[PDB]
Design a protein around this ligand. Structure first.
Ligand SMILES: CCCCC/C=C/C/C=C/C/C=C\C/C=C\CCCC(=O)O[C@H](COC(=O)CCCCCCCCCCCCCCCCC)COP(=O)(O)O[C@@H]1[C@H](O)[C@H](O)[C@@H](O)[C@H](O)[C@H]1O
Ligand SMILES: COC1=C(OC)C(=O)C(C/C=C(\C)CC/C=C(\C)CC/C=C(\C)CC/C=C(/C)CC/C=C(\C)CC/C=C(\C)CC/C=C(\C)CC/C=C(/C)CCC=C(C)C)=C(C)C1=O
Ligand SMILES: CCCCCCCCCCCCCCCCCC(=O)OC[C@H](COP(=O)(O)OCCN)OC(=O)CCCCCCCCCCCCCCCCC
Ligand SMILES: CCCCCCCCCCCCCCCCCC(=O)OC[C@H](COP(=O)(O)OCCN)OC(=O)CCCCCCCCCCCCCCCCC
Ligand SMILES: CCCCCCCCCCCCCCCCCC(=O)OC[C@H](COP(=O)(O)OCCN)OC(=O)CCCCCCCCCCCCCCCCC
Ligand SMILES: CCCCCCCCCCCCCCCCCC(=O)OC[C@H](COP(=O)(O)OCCN)OC(=O)CCCCCCCCCCCCCCCCC
Ligand SMILES: CCCCCCCCCCCC(=O)OC[C@H](COP(=O)(O)OCC[N+](C)(C)C)OC(=O)CCCCCCCCCCC
Ligand SMILES: CCCCCCCCCCCC(=O)OC[C@H](COP(=O)(O)OCC[N+](C)(C)C)OC(=O)CCCCCCCCCCC
Ligand SMILES: CCCCCCCCCCCC(=O)OC[C@H](COP(=O)(O)OCC[N+](C)(C)C)OC(=O)CCCCCCCCCCC
Ligand SMILES: CCCCCCCCCCCC(=O)OC[C@H](COP(=O)(O)OCC[N+](C)(C)C)OC(=O)CCCCCCCCCCC
Ligand code: SF4
Ligand code: SF4
Ligand code: SF4
Lengths: 340, 56, 127, 61, 123, 140, 388, 77, 190
C-alpha cells in the first residue's frame, strides 16, 4: 500500500514536470531557429519559466461572460485536463512498467483519444456566439477527421502483433522496429499526430478563425492553465504512441555483452541500471519526437479548411485503403500470420 | 459608372468637402467619426474643431 | 488496490485543487462592460440563426460509417492466425465492399465546397 | 572644393551577388525510391522472419 | 465596389417638391419602424417612444425650409444617418450624442435671467 | 510571478507598432524577458497604447481595456499616445489615452526607441516589485 | 433569399494589421459582400499641412506610410521642387536614389514578412526584421532618429553622409544577397505556401486600370508600367536595372515580383555605391534652404537668410502640381496647390493603398474566409496611407 | 373583426392633438376629421401595424388616409 | 514610318507573346520521378533543412541594460539647454526654436534681466507633443538647445514629462561631457 502510492506519486511528478518544461524548451528552440535566445531572465539559464507563467496565471481572475453557461465553461477544462492526463497510465517505461498493466492497453489508449474531442466542441457552446460556434465546428470536424486515420494506423500495426497489449508489442519489436519496414507509415502517422493536437502546421482556429485566440479566446486563469496543460500533455502523449508502436518503445540495442562484462548477479543496482537504459532509450525517442513537432512548427504556413479536408479524405485515406489491402496480403503470401 | 475605382475617391471628396456626386451608390462618410457634424477640409471649419472626447 | 485506480481518482483531485486555488486566491470584481463576448473590440448583434454548407454537416455524418468499419476490422486483427487463408478472403471482400462505397463518395465530390468566384466565362459577343 | 567627404574607391568595389543562388541538391528521385523500397523490403524480411520464429516459440510453449 | 451596402440608396436629386415630400415621408416611416431595433441594438436605458419622439422632433426642426436644393442635401444627410444607425456602425456613445439632456441633469444654478447669466459672466 | 511572465495585448496601430515589432525582433528580444503577445485582452495582463487615439476609436480602446482581468496595468507608448502628440490640434484625435484609460508608465519618443520601450517595461516591472498585494491586506 | 451572416474583422485582430474594421457578410464560408471601414486611424493630417510651412509640413509625410519613410519624403520634396523651379545637385540625386532603395528593401522586407506571418510562416518575420535592424542602423547614422527621418528635404538633402558609411553599405550588401536567397527557400517552393496563394486575388488587366491599381498589383497582372522607368526622376535613368512583372493576376505573381525587386534594389545600391560623385548635397542657394553653420556665424547675408527661412520660410510661386512617384506600395503622388504664400493653400496625398483597399470587394467576392487574409497581405495595407 | 376595429380605435385613441376621443367614427379621415399632420398620418399607421405584427409595403402605406381604409386593409393576413 | 494615332513607338516588345503552357505529355519528367517528389515531399524537406541549419548558428540578441545598441552622434533623445564655458545660460531668447517646431511644443517668455542682457524668463517643452524632428537644434544660432542621446527617461505621470527651464538646464548640465562627444563629430556636418 505504501509502495503503490509512492510509485504513482513519482510518475505523476515526473510527468507533470515534463509537460511544464516542454513549453520552455519549445520557446528556447523556436528562438534559436529564428536566431534569438529564449527566456533567460527567470532562472539561472531560463529554467522555471513555466512556473512563473503558472503562478501568475493562477492569480488572474476568472471572468464568465453573460452569454455563457458558467458550469460548462469551467467543466470543459476539467474534462480536457483529465482526458489528456488519464492516457499516461498505459505507456511502459520498460518491460511491464506501467501504472496499470491491462491486457488490452491499445483499446484504452484509443478510447481516451476519442474522449478528447468533446472539450473542443462543448467549449464552443459555452459563450454561444455565431462567430465562435462555427469555429468550434471547423475544429471538431478536423479533429475527428484525422482521428480516423490515427485509429487506422494503429490497426495496421496490430496486424503484426495480434495482441492489444503494449509491452507485448515492444517485446515483439526486438527483432526489428516497425518504422523501418513501414517508412511511409511513419510520415503519415507523424502528420496525423500533428493534426490530432491541432499544431500550427495544421491549425486554423488559433490564428485564422474569427476569434483571435482560438475557441478558448474569452478565458483567464484556471480555464486557461488547464487547456494549456492539456495541449502539451497531448503532445507528449501522441509522441508516446509513436514511441511504442512505430519506433522502439524502450529498446536501443542488445546490451547482453556489456552486462556480462559489468555485473555478476542480479541485484538492485542491476535493475536500476537496466531501468535507466530502458527509460533513457524511450526518453530519447520521445525527445527527438517533440523536437520534430517544434521543428515543423517553425518552417511552415497553415491550411485552409478546404485544403485540410481535401488532404485527409481525398489523398491520405485512399492511400490508406491501399495499405489495408497490401499488408495482410504480404503477411498472406509468405506463410506468416502472427499468433496470440 | 465608368470607373469601378472612382467611387471611394468620390466619397472621400464627399466627407472632407461636402461635394455631391449624383448617381452614386454608397455615398456617405468615410475616414471621419460616424456622428461627426461638419466637413473638415473647408475654410470655415476651425482646426481643432467643435467637439472633444473624454470618458465620463 | 492496484495503482491503476489511484490515478483515475487522483488526476481530478489535482484539477479540482488548481481550480480551487484560482477561485480562492484571485479577486472577482466584475461589471457589465467587462462581461460580454469578445469580437475584436467591437460589440455587435448576433444573428439568431445562420446558414451553413452541406459539406460541414456531411463530414461528421459521413465520419461514423467509416469509424464503424475501423472498429469492425478490430475483431479480425486479433484472430488473424486462427482464420488462416479463409477469414483473410472474407476480410478482403468486406474491405472491397467498403472501398466501392468510398469511391462513390470521392467521385461525387461530396466533401468539396465549390467557389462562386467565376472569372466571367462568357466572352463579349456584340450587337 | 570638396574635402573630407566619403567617396568610392578609385578602382571601385567588387561585384556583389544578386542572382538567385538556388542549386538543385539531392539524388535523383528514382534513387530515393529505390532506397525506400530497399529499406522497406529488408524491414519486411526481418519482421516476417521474427513472426515465424515467434510462431515456433508458441508451438513449444 | 460592384454591389452596395444593404440599406443604401443611390443619391438622386428631385426637381419637384412633392417627390421630395414623398421621399421624406417614406424616410420618416423607415426611422419609425426601426426604433425598437435601435433600442435593442444600443442597449439604452429608456423606452422606445422617446426614440420615436426624438425622430419626430428632428423633423420638426426643418419643417419651414423653403429651398428645394437645401431640402435635398438635408434629405441625403438624413438617409446617411439612417444607414449608419440601422446597420449598427455607429456605437452607443455616438448614438447617445442625440440625447445629451435626457441622460443627466447637468447641475444646479441654470442661468435664465440677465442677473444669473451675469454673476458667472455666461460661464 | 507577475514579472517573469508579462503578457501584453498587441493594441499597437500605427508608427509605434513597428517599433514594437522591433522588440519582437532578434536584436532586442522580448521572449528573453518573458514577454509574449497574447493577442486577446482576456489573457493579457497589460495593454500598450502604441500609436494615436482618434475620436472614432476611444470607445473601442476602452472596450478592449474593460475586458482584461483585474490585475491590469497599461503603458503608453509614443508621443501620439500621451497628449495627442504631433496631431495635438486636430479635430479627430484624443489628446492622449489619459482621458480614456488609466495609464501607469509613459514611454516618450515619437518613435520611442526599442531601447526606450524596453526601459519602460523595466520601469513597469519595478512598479510590480513594490505593489505589495499581501502586505496591503495587513494594512501597513 | 440568401441571408448573410455579418462579421467584422475589427481592430483588435492580429491579421487586420491593427486598424482595419472589415464588415464581411458570408454565407457559409464564401464572402458575398465586403465592406472595409476606415477612419480609426484618421487624424486630419491634410487639414494640418495647410497651417504649417513647407519645411514644417515635411514630417507629416513620413508619419503616414510609416513603413517606407524616405519615399514619402521624396514625393513631397519633388512636388515642391517642381513648383520652386530649382535643380538639386548631382550628389543629392544619387544619394536619394540610394536611400530610396534601402527604403524599398525595407518596405518589401516588412511587407513580405508580415504577409508570411498573416498566413502562418513565423521564421521570415524574424529574419527579415533582423535585416531591418541592419538597415535602421544606417538610418540612425544618416539622420538622427531611426524610424522617422526628415532627411529628404524640398531643397534636396538634409546634410552630408557620415564619414565612413559608403564602405559599410557594401559590407552589408555582400551578405544580404545570401540572406534573401534563404528566405526564398521555404516560401517559393513550399507546397503549402503555393496552394494557399495560387488563384487567390486574381486581377484581370482591364480591371486593374478601372480600379486605379498600380505598382506591384498592376505589374502582378501583366501590364508593364513603372514610373522610375517610364517617367524617370532623381537619377534613375543613369542607373541600370530590370523590372519584374507577373503574368497571372494572382497573389503568387504579386509575390514573385516582390521577391525580385529586392534583387533589383540591391543592384541599384551597388551601382550607386560605385558611381557616387563629389559635390554639394543641398541646393545651391540660401533663399530656399539654410546656410551651413560655419558660414552663417561669419556672414551677415547668410545670417539674414538663416533667420528668415525658419521664422517665415521660403515662398513658393503660385501654381498647382500633381507629382507621382513609385513607392514600393505602388504609385504614390501628391497634389499641392500653392497660394504664393509660404504655407500650402492645399495639399493632398494619393495613398497607394487607398485604391487597393477600395478594390477589396471587387476581388474578394466568392473567396473563402482564410483567403480574405492572404489578399490583405498583397495589397500591403499599412493604414498610415489609407486614412490620414 | 368587430373586436379588431375596436383595437384600431383603441390604438388611435392613445395619442395627442385629438381634443375629442369620441370623434373616432368608422369613416374618420386622419387629416380632416381628426386634425392630424403630415407626419402624424405615418406615425399612426406604423402604430397600427405595430399592434398586429404584420408589415406593410409603401404603396399600401401611402394610400391609407382614413380609418375606413385601415379596416378595409386589415385582412392582409 | 508614320504611326496611326493612338499609336506611338511603344509597340509591343519583341517576344511579348506568351508560349502556350505545356501539356502533361510534353514534360521531361517521368510520372514516377515527379510523383516521388510528390509523395516524398521533397522541397518541404529542403525548407526543413534550411531552418535546421539555422539552429546551429549564432543568435543576434544583445542584453539591453547591460549592452546597448548602436549610436550615431546625430541621434536624438531628450532635450538639454547647454551652458557656455564659465557658466552662462546660452539662450538668448531668439524664439527661433519656437517658430520652427512643427508640433508647437516650445513655449518661451523672455524678459530683459538686470544686466541688460537678453535672456529667457520661462523656457518650456511639452514632451508629450514633441516629435523629435531636431529642427529646434538645427535652428538655434547660439546652439543653446540640443538633443542628448538619452532615451531612458520614461516616467509615470504626465506632470513629470513637462520640462520647464530648470529641468532642461539640469539636463544640459548633466549631459555636457557627452554632448561634447556628439558635437565634436557632428558640427562640421551641420
Ligand atoms: C509560496 C511558495 C509556493 C507558491 C505557491 C503559489 C503562489 C502563491 C502566492 C500568492 C500570494 C497571495 C496572492 C493573493 C492576493 O494577494 O490577493 C488578495 C488576497 O490578499 C491576501 O490576503 C493574501 C492571503 C493569501 C493566503 C495565502 C495563500 C498562499 C498560497 C497557497 C497556494 C486579494 O484580496 P481580496 O480579499 O480582495 O480577494 C478576494 C478573494 O480573492 C476571492 O476569493 C473573492 O471571491 C473576491 O471577492 C476577492 O475580494
Ligand atoms: C509566435 O509567438 C508565440 C510563441 O513564441 C514566442 C509561443 O510560445 C506561444 C505559446 C505560449 C506559451 C508557450 C506561453 C504559456 C506557458 C505556460 C502557461 C506555462 C504553464 C505552466 C504550467 C502549466 C506548470 C505545470 C507544473 C505543475 C502543475 C507542477 C507539478 C507539481 C504563442 C501562442 C505564440 O503566439
Ligand atoms: C469503470 C469505468 C469504465 C470501464 C473501464 C474499464 C477499463 C479496463 O479495461 O480495466 C481493465 C483492468 C483489468 O483488466 P485486465 O486486462 O484483465 O488486467 C490484467 C492484469 N494482469 O481494470 C483494472 O485494473 C482496475 C479497474 C478500474 C476501473 C474500476 C472502477 C469500478 C467502477 C465502479 C463504479 C461505482 C459507481
Ligand atoms: C511504387 C510504389 C508506390 C510509390 C508511392 C509510395 C506511396 C506511399 C508514400 C506515402 C507517403 C505519403 C506522405 C503524405 C503525402 C502527402 C501528399 C502531399 O504532398 O499533399 C499534396 C497536397 C496537394 O494536393 P494536389 O491537389 O494534388 O496538388 C496539385 C497542385 N495542382 O498538398 C498538401 O496537402 C500540403 C502538403 C501537406 C504535407 C503535410 C506536411 C506537414 C508535416 C511534414 C512532416 C515532415 C516530417 C519531418 C519529421 C522529422 C524528419 C526527420
Ligand atoms: C473545484 C473546487 C470547487 C469550487 C467551486 C466553488 C464555487 C464557488 C463559486 C461561487 O460562489 O458561485 C459562483 C457563481 C457565479 O455565477 P453567477 O454570479 O450567479 O452569474 C454570473 C454570470 N456572469 O454563483 C452561483 O450562482 C453559484 C453556482 C454554484 C453553486 C455553488 C454555491 C457556492 C456557495 C458558496 C458557499
Ligand atoms: C525515403 C528516404 C530514405 C532515406 C534516405 C535515402 C538516401 C538515399 C540512399 C542512396 C545511397 C547512396 O548514397 O547513393 C549512392 C551514391 C550515388 O548513387 P548513384 O550515382 O545513383 O549510383 C549508384 C550506383 N551504385 O553513391 C555515392 O555517393 C558514393 C560516394 C563515394 C565517394 C564519396 C566521396
Ligand atoms: C531541476 C529543475 C529546477 C532547476 C531550476 C533552478 C532555477 C533557480 O533556482 O532560480 C533561482 C530562483 C530565482 O532566481 P532569479 O532571481 O529569478 O534569477 C535571476 C538571474 N537572471 C537575472 C539571470 C535571470 O531563486 C529561488 O529562490 C528559487 C527557490 C525555489 C526553487 C524551485 C525549484 C522548483 C523545481
Ligand atoms: C545525422 C544523419 C542524418 C541523415 C540524413 C537524413 C536521412 C537522409 C536524407 C537524404 C538526403 C541526402 O543525404 O541526399 C544527399 C544529397 C547530396 O547529394 P548531391 O550533392 O545532390 O549529388 C547527387 C548527384 N547525383 C544525383 C548525380 C547522384 O543531399 C545533401 O546532402 C544535402 C544536405 C542534407 C544533409 C543531411 C545529413 C546527411 C549528411 C549527407 C552529406 C552528403
Ligand atoms: C534530423 C536529420 C536531418 C534530416 C533533415 C532532412 C534532410 C533533407 C535533405 C534534402 C533532400 C532533398 O532535398 O532531395 C531533393 C530530391 C529532389 O532532387 P531534384 O530537385 O529532383 O534534383 C534534380 C537535379 N539532379 C538530379 C541533377 C541533382 O528529393 C527527392 O527526390 C525525394 C525526396 C525524399 C526526401 C527524404 C529525406 C528523408 C529525411 C527524413 C530523415
Ligand atoms: C507484393 C509482395 C511481393 C514480394 C516479392 C518479394 C520476393 C523476395 C524473395 C525473398 C524471400 C526470402 O527468401 O526471404 C524469406 C523470409 C525469411 O524467412 P526465413 O525464416 O529465413 O525462412 C525459413 C523457413 N522456415 C521458417 C520454414 C524455417 O521471409 C519473408 O517473408 C521475407 C520476404 C521478403 C520481404 C518481401 C516484402 C516485399 C515488400 C511488400 C511491401 C508491402
Ligand atoms: S507616436 Fe510618433 S511614430 Fe508613433 S504613431 Fe504617433 S506620430 Fe507615428
Ligand atoms: S534655445 Fe536657441 S532658438 Fe531657442 S530661444 Fe534660445 S537661442 Fe533661440
Ligand atoms: S525636436 Fe522638433 S518638435 Fe521637438 S522641440 Fe525640437 S523642433 Fe519642436
Amino acid at each position: 500500500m505504501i509502495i503503490n502510492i509512492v510509485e504513482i506519486l513519482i510518475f505523476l511528478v515526473c510527468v507533470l514536470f515534463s509537460v511544464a518544461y516542454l513549453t520552455v524548451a519549445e520557446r528556447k528552440t523556436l528562438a534559436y531557429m529564428q536566431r534569438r535566445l529564449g527566456p533567460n531572465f527567470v532562472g539561472y539559464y531560463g529554467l522555471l519559466q513555466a512556473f512563473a507563467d503558472a503562478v501568475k496565471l493562477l492569480l488572474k481572475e476568472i471572468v464568465l461572460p453573460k452569454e455563457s453557461n458558467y458550469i460548462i465553461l469551467v467543466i470543459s477544462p476539467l474534462i480536457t485536463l483529465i482526458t489528456a492526463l488519464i492516457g499516461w497510465v498505459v505507456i511502459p517505461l520498460g518491460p511491464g512498467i506501467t501504472l496499470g498493466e491491462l491486457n488490452l492497453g491499445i483499446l484504452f489508449s484509443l478510447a481516451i483519444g476519442s474522449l478528447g474531442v468533446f472539450g473542443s466542441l462543448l467549449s464552443g457552446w459555452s459563450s454561444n456566439s455565431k462567430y465562435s460556434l462555427l469555429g468550434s465546428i471547423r475544429s471538431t470536424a478536423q479533429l475527428i477527421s484525422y482521428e480516423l486515420i490515427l485509429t487506422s494506423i494503429f490497426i495496421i500495426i496490430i496486424m503484426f502483433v495480434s495482441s492489444l497489449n503494449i509491452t507485448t508489442i515492444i517485446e515483439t519489436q526486438r527483432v526489428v522496429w516497425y518504422c523501418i519496414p513501414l517508412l511511409p507509415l511513419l510520415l503519415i502517422f507523424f502528420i496525423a499526430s500533428v493534426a490530432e493536437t491541432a499544431r500550427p502546421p495544421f491549425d486554423l482556429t488559433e490564428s485564422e478563425s474569427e476569434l483571435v485566440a482560438g475557441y478558448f479566446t474569452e478565458y483567464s486563469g484556471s480555464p486557461f492553465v488547464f487547456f494549456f496543460l492539456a495541449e502539451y500533455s497531448n503532445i507528449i502523449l501522441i509522441s508516446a504512441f509513436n514511441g511504442y508502436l512505430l519506433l522502439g518503445g524502450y529498446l536501443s540495442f542488445n546490451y547482453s555483452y556489456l552486462f556480462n562484462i559489468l555485473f555478476n548477479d542480479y541485484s538492485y543496482v542491476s535493475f536500476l541500471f537496466e531501468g535507466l537504459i530502458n527509460s533513457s532509450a524511450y526518453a530519447i525517442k520521445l525527445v527527438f519526437l517533440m523536437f520534430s513537432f517544434i521543428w515543423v512548427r517553425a518552417a511552415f504556413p497553415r491550411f485552409t479548411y478546404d485544403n485540410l479536408i481535401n488532404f485527409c479524405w481525398i489523398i491520405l485515406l485512399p492511400l490508406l485503403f491501399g495499405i489495408f489491402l497490401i499488408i495482410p496480403s504480404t503477411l498472406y503470401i509468405f506463410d506468416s500470420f502472427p499468433t496470440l | 459608372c465608368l470607373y469601378e475605382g472612382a467611387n471611394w475617391f468620390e466619397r472621400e471628396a464627399y466627407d472632407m468637402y461636402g461635394v455631391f456626386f449624383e448617381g452614386h451608390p454608397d455615398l456617405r462618410r468615410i475616414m471621419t467619426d460616424y456622428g461627426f457634424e461638419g466637413h473638415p477640409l473647408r475654410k470655415d471649419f476651425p482646426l481643432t474643431g467643435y467637439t472633444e472626447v473624454r470618458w465620463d | 488496490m492496484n495503482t491503476f485506480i489511484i490515478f483515475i481518482i487522483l488526476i481530478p483531485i489535482v484539477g479540482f485543487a488548481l481550480l480551487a486555488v484560482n477561485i480562492l486566491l484571485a479577486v472577482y470584481k466584475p461589471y457589465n462592460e467587462k462581461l460580454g463576448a469578445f469580437e475584436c473590440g467591437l460589440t455587435s448583434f448576433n444573428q439568431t440563426r445562420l446558414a451553413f454548407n452541406a459539406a460541414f454537416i456531411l463530414v461528421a455524418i459521413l465520419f461514423l460509417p467509416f469509424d464503424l468499419e475501423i472498429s469492425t476490422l478490430l475483431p479480425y486483427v486479433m484472430s488473424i492466425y486462427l482464420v488462416s487463408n479463409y477469414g483473410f478472403t472474407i476480410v478482403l471482400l468486406f474491405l472491397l465492399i467498403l472501398i466501392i462505397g468510398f469511391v462513390y463518395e470521392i467521385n461525387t465530390n461530396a466533401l468539396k465546397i465549390n467557389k462562386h468566384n467565376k472569372p466571367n466565362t462568357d466572352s463579349l459577343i456584340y450587337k | 572644393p570638396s574635402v573630407g567627404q566619403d567617396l568610392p574607391p578609385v578602382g571601385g568595389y567588387e561585384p556583389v551577388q544578386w542572382r538567385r543562388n538556388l542549386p538543385a541538391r539531392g539524388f535523383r528521385p528514382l534513387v530515393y525510391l529505390a532506397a525506400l523500397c530497399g529499406i522497406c523490403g529488408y524491414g519486411f524480411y526481418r519482421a516476417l522472419g521474427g513472426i515465424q520464429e515467434r510462431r515456433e516459440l508458441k508451438r513449444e510453449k | 465596389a460592384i454591389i452596395a451596402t444593404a440599406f443604401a440608396e443611390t443619391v438622386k436629386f428631385s426637381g419637384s417638391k412633392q417627390e421630395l415630400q414623398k421621399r421624406t415621408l417614406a424616410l420618416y416611416r423607415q426611422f419609425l419602424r426601426g426604433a425598437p431595433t435601435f433600442a435593442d441594438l444600443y442597449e439604452v436605458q429608456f423606452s422606445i417612444p422617446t426614440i420615436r419622439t426624438k425622430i419626430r422632433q428632428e423633423f420638426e426642426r426643418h419643417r419651414f425650409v423653403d429651398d428645394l436644393s437645401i431640402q435635398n442635401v438635408l434629405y441625403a444627410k438624413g438617409h446617411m444617418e439612417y444607414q449608419e444607425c440601422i446597420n449598427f456602425w455607429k456605437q452607443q456613445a455616438q448614438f447617445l450624442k442625440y440625447f445629451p439632456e435626457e441622460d443627466d441633469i447637468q447641475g444646479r444654478h441654470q442661468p435664465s435671467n440677465f442677473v444669473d447669466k451675469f454673476l458667472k459672466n455666461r460661464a | 510571478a507577475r514579472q517573469g511572465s508579462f503578457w501584453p495585448v498587441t493594441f499597437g496601430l500605427a508608427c509605434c507598432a513597428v517599433e514594437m515589432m522591433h522588440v519582437s525582433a532578434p536584436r532586442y528580444d522580448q521572449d528573453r524577458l518573458g514577454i509574449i503577445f497574447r493577442a486577446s485582452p482576456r489573457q493579457s495582463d497589460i495593454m500598450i497604447v502604441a500609436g494615436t487615439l482618434t475620436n472614432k476609436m476611444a470607445p473601442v480602446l476602452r472596450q478592449v481595456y474593460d475586458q482584461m482581468p483585474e490585475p491590469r496595468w497599461v503603458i503608453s507608448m509614443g508621443s501620439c499616445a500621451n497628449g495627442g502628440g504631433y496631431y495635438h490640434f486636430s479635430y479627430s484625435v484624443v489628446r492622449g489615452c489619459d482621458r480614456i484609460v488609466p495609464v501607469d508608465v509613459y514611454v516618450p519618443g515619437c518613435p520611442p526607441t526599442s531601447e526606450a520601450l524596453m526601459y519602460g517595461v523595466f520601469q513597469l516591472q519595478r512598479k510590480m516589485r513594490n505593489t505589495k498585494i499581501t502586505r496591503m491586506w495587513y494594512r501597513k | 433569399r440568401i441571408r448573410a451572416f455579418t462579421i467584422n474583422f475589427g481592430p483588435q485582430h492580429p491579421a487586420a494589421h491593427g486598424v482595419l474594421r472589415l464588415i464581411l457578410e458570408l454565407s457559409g464560408e464564401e464572402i458575398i459582400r465586403s465592406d472595409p471601414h476606415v477612419g480609426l486611424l484618421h487624424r486630419g493630417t491634410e487639414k494640418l499641412i495647410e497651417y504649417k510651412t513647407y519645411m514644417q509640413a515635411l514630417p507629416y509625410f513620413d508619419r503616414l506610410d510609416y513603413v517606407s519613410m524616405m519615399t514619402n519624403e521624396q514625393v513631397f520634396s519633388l512636388a515642391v521642387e517642381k513648383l520652386l523651379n530649382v535643380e538639386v545637385p548631382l550628389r543629392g540625386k544619387y544619394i536619394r536614389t540610394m536611400f530610396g532603395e534601402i527604403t524599398r528593401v525595407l518596405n518589401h522586407l516588412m511587407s513580405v514578412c508580415s504577409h508570411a506571418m498573416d498566413v502562418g510562416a513565423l521564421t521570415p518575420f524574424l529574419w527579415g526584421f533582423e535585416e531591418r535592424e541592419k538597415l535602421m542602423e544606417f538610418y540612425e547614422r544618416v539622420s538622427g532618429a531611426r524610424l522617422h527621418a526628415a532627411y529628404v528635404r524640398p531643397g534636396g538633402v538634409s546634410q552630408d553622409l557620415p564619414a565612413g558609411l559608403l564602405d559599410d553599405i557594401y559590407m552589408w550588401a555582400t551578405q544580404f544577397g545570401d540572406r534573401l536567397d534563404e528566405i526564398e527557400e521555404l516560401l517559393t517552393d513550399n507546397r503549402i505556401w503555393k496552394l494557399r496563394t495560387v488563384n487567390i486575388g486574381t486581377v484581370t488587366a482591364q480591371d486593374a486600370l478601372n480600379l486605379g491599381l498600380s505598382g506591384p498589383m498592376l505589374r502582378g497582372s501583366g501590364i508593364p508600367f513603372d514610373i522610375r522607368k517610364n517617367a524617370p526622376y532623381d537619377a534613375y535613368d543613369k542607373v541600370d536595372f530590370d523590372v519584374p512583372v507577373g503574368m497571372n493576376g494572382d497573389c503568387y505573381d504579386r509575390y514573385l515580383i516582390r521577391m525580385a525587386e529586392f534583387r533589383q534594389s540591391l543592384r541599384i545600391i551597388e551601382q550607386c555605391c560605385n558611381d557616387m560623385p563629389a559635390g554639394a548635397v543641398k541646393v545651391e542657394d540660401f533663399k530656399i534652404n539654410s546656410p551651413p553653420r560655419n558660414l552663417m556665424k561669419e556672414d551677415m547675408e547668410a545670417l539674414i537668410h538663416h533667420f528668415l527661412l525658419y521664422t517665415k520660410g521660403y515662398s513658393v510661386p503660385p501654381g498647382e502640381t500633381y507629382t507621382a512617384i513609385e513607392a514600393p506600395k505602388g504609385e504614390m503622388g501628391v497634389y499641392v496647390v500653392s497660394d504664393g504664400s509660404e504655407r500650402p493653400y492645399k495639399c493632398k496625398i494619393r495613398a497607394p493603398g487607398f485604391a487597393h483597399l477600395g478594390a477589396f470587394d471587387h476581388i474578394a467576392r466568392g473567396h473563402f474566409l482564410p483567403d480574405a487574409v492572404a489578399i490583405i497581405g498583397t495589397m500591403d495595407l499599412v493604414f498610415g496611407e489609407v486614412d490620414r | 373583426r368587430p373586436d379588431a376595429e375596436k383595437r384600431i380605435a383603441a390604438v388611435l385613441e392613445s395619442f395627442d392633438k385629438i381634443s375629442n376621443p369620441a370623434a373616432i367614427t368608422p369613416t374618420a379621415s386622419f387629416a380632416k376629421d381628426l386634425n392630424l399632420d403630415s407626419l402624424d398620418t405615418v406615425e399612426v399607421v406604423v402604430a397600427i401595424e405595430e399592434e398586429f405584427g404584420i408589415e406593410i409595403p409603401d404603396k399600401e402605406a401611402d394610400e391609407i388616409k382614413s380609418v375606413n381604409q385601415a379596416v378595409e386593409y386589415i385582412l392582409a393576413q | 514610318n508614320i504611326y496611326a494615332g493612338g499609336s506611338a513607338a511603344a509597340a509591343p516588345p519583341a517576344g511579348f507573346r506568351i508560349h502556350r503552357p505545356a501539356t502533361w505529355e510534353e514534360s521531361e519528367e517521368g510520372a514516377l520521378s515527379k510523383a516521388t517528389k510528390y509523395f516524398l515531399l521533397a522541397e518541404m524537406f529542403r525548407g526543413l533543412y534550411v531552418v535546421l541549419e539555422q539552429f546551429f548558428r549564432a543568435p543576434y540578441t544583445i542584453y539591453y541594460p547591460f549592452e546597448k545598441g548602436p549610436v550615431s552622434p546625430r541621434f536624438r533623445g531628450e532635450h538639454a539647454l547647454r551652458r557656455y564655458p564659465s557658466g552662462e545660460e546660452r539662450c538668448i531668447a531668439c524664439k527661433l526654436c519656437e517658430a520652427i517646431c512643427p508640433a508647437l511644443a516650445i513655449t518661451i517668455d523672455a524678459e530683459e534681466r538686470i544686466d541688460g542682457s537678453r535672456r529667457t524668463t520661462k523656457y518650456d517643452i511639452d514632451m508629450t507633443k514633441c516629435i523629435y524632428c531636431g529642427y529646434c537644434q538645427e535652428s538655434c544660432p547660439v546652439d543653446a538647445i540640443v538633443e542628448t542621446p538619452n532615451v531612458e527617461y520614461a516616467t509615470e505621470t504626465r506632470e513629470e514629462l513637462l520640462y520647464n527651464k530648470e529641468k532642461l538646464l539640469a539636463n544640459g548640465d548633466k549631459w555636457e561631457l557627452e554632448l561634447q562627444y556628439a558635437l565634436d563629430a557632428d558640427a562640421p556636418y551641420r
